[PDB]
Amino acid sequence: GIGIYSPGIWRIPHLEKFLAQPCQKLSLLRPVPQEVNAIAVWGHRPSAAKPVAIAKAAGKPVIRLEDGFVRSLDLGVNGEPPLSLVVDDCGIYYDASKPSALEKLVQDKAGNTALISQAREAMHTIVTGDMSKYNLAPAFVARTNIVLVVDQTFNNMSVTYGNAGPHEFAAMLEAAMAENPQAEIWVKVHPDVLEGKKTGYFADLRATQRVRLIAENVSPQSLLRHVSRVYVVTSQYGFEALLAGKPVTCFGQPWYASWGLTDDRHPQSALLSARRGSATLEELFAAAYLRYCRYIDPQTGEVSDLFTVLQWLQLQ
Ligand SMILES: Nc1ccn([C@@H]2O[C@H](COP(=O)(O)O)[C@@H](O)[C@H]2O)c(=O)n1
Ligand SMILES: O=C(O)[C@@]1(O)C[C@@H](O)[C@@H](O)[C@@H]([C@H](O)CO)O1
Ligand SMILES: [Cl-]
Numbered sequence: 001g002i003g004i005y006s007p008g009i010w011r012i013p014h015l016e017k018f019l020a021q022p023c024q025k026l027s028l029l030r031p032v033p034q035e036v037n038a039i040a041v042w043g044h045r046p047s048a049a050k051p052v053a054i055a056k057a058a059g060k061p062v063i064r065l066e067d068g069f070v071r072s073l074d075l076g077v078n079g080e081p082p083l084s085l086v087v088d089d090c091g092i093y094y095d096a097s098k099p100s101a102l103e104k105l106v107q108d109k110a111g112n113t114a115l116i117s118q119a120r121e122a123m124h125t126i127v128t129g130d131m132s133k134y135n136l137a138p139a140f141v142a143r144t145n146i147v148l149v150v151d152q153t154f155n156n157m158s159v160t161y162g163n164a165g166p167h168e169f170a171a172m173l174e175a176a177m178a179e180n181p182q183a184e185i186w187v188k189v190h191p192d193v194l195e196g197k198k199t200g201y202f203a204d205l206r207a208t209q210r211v212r213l214i215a216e217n218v219s220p221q222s223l224l225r226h227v228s229r230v231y232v233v234t235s236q237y238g239f240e241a242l243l244a245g246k247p248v249t250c251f252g253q254p255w256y257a258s259w260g261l262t263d264d265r266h267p268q269s270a271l272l273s274a275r276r277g278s279a280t281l282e283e284l285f286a287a288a289y290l291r292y293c294r295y296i297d298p299q300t301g302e303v304s305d306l307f308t309v310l311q312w313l314q315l316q
Contacts, residue, residue, distance in 0.1 A: 002063065003036040005051045009065065014301035018065075018085040018294050026051075032058045040065055043092050044157050064092040068293040069236060070126075070309060071133050073316055077197040083309050084293045093292070094158035094234065096253035096272055105287040106259065106279050115286040118307075123285055125310050127243055130221045133236055134191060135313045140218035140226065145183040148227040148246075149176050150237040153190050153198040162234040163266060164252030169201035169233055172251045175265070176231045177211070183228065185211045188237075201233075220244075238262065239288075242281055256284055 002019060003026040004010050010025055012018070019040070026032060028050055032039065039055040040063040041048035048064070055062050067076060068084025076082065086093060091100040105111070112119075125131065130139060149172060152159060159165060176185055187205065192198040194217050207213045214223075220237060224230070224244040232238035234252035241248045242261060249263040257264050258273035261281060266272075279287075289306055297304035298312045 001035065001037045003032060003039045003060075005039070006042055006045070006047050008047075009040065009042055012085075013081045014296045017296045017301055017303050019087065020294075020303070028054070032060060036060060038063050038089070042066070044095070044161060061089065064088045066092060066094075067133075068295070069133055069239075069289055070131065070293070070295075070306065070313070072135070073313060074136050075134050075191055075195060075197075077192050077195055083298055083313075084295045084306075086292050087294060088292075092161070093255040093288075095161040096163055096257075096268075097161070099275070100255070102255055102288060102292045103276060105291050106284055107277060108287075109279075109283060111291070112283040112286040115290050116282050118290060119282045119286040122289060122306050122310065123243055123282070125307075125314075126240075127221050129310070129314055130219045131310060131313060132220045132240060135219070135316070137191065137217040137219045139222040140216075142226065143184045144228075145180070146227045147176050147180045147183045147185050148224070148230045148241070149173050149185060149187045150230065150232045150235045151187060151189050151193070151200040151202050152233060152235050153192050154201060154203075156198075158234045158254065159252060162252040162254050163268060164233045166201055168251040168266070171265075172231050172233055172249075173202070173205075173211075175249070175251070180229075186214055186227070187211065188214045188223070190235075191217050239284070243285070255288070259284060 002023045005026050038061045039051050041051050043066045052062050066086045067082050071082050072080045074080040088101040091098050093100050093102040193200045220240045229247040230241040231249045234254040238248045239256040250257045251265050253266050258276050259279040295304045295309045
């Protein structure tokens with residue numbers, strides 16, 4: 001029932017197990033069939049624009065896909081298939097300009113309360129089992145007052161649609177340095193940049209004695225254990241820091257900002273917080289990791305759950 005134009009999407013292994021619905025390939029060169037009840041695209045990739053306009057003009061709704069928050073062993077830039085996808089029938093999680101399906105799941109508190117025991121169980125497995133979106137980095141080993149500043153991939157869609165850009169990165173690091181005069185500043189490069197497939201926002205940062213550059217691929221939770229507080233623009237690292245029990249200052253508008261849990265600096269923070277309301281950490285985790293994300297079994301490709309994928313990711 002769902003039409004897909006993107007060959008890249010069409011090509012995702014076990015895609016049909018993620019969508020839980022029949023899917024069919026559509027061509028831009030002919031009308032959308034009436035049978036199609038929705039059109040699915042990848043986030044806001046440039047390829048999504050033409051299918052979005054088509055769907056609008058035929059009155060069909062758009063579904064936006066993206067990788068899950070526990071995705072795979074190696075990076076997507078290296079061609080590793082995903083073990084989790086998100087499926088968003090309202091917007092997409094990283095677009096702060098309007099509600100996403102994730103935002104409405106967070107606000108459905110009753111539905112998150114029903115999952116609190118699974119959420120606590122999975123949260124513990126992630127923090128003490130040292131898990132993250134990617135899971136091939138080795139644990140970190142090595143002053144005690146450390147401020148973590150998180151770099152990202154240049155022009156990533158979670159920055160642009162989270163109302164940020166190069167300025168918020170410069171402002172983030174100047175704020176980190178100025179608000180913690182005696183702390184040591186640690187700038188973590190994104191693994192895609194370390195893989196040489198992307199560039200960072202601090203490409204031309206000059207390191208000092210107080211500003212140390214961490215250009216090593218290390219697992220988030222292990223590095224977080226040595227940090228006092230975290231500064232982000234929009235990175236998923238920010239939510240993982242909250243799971244580690246660390247304070248988080250946000251300079252863009254990611255999916256986990258403006259719920260009452262983060263020190264939000266974006267100029268439109270008050271507007272977004274008014275729309276979102278309040279939420280607990282466990283509500284956010286249940287909504288995002290258990291309800292918004294879908295999983296497949298890594299050995300069979302059949303529909304699965306977070307716990308099965310966490311288990312299979314942990315022995316490697
Ligand atoms: N500076 C950074 C930024 C991201 N990452 C990794 O990349 C994942 C995704 O983060 P992004 O939203 O920044 O793409 C994180 O969960 C984390 O595993 C990292 O290890 N160091
Ligand atoms: O259409 C896509 O977006 C694509 O083919 C390219 C990348 O998004 C890449 O992540 C790929 C993965 O197979 C999905 O994670 O999907
Ligand atoms: Cl369980």
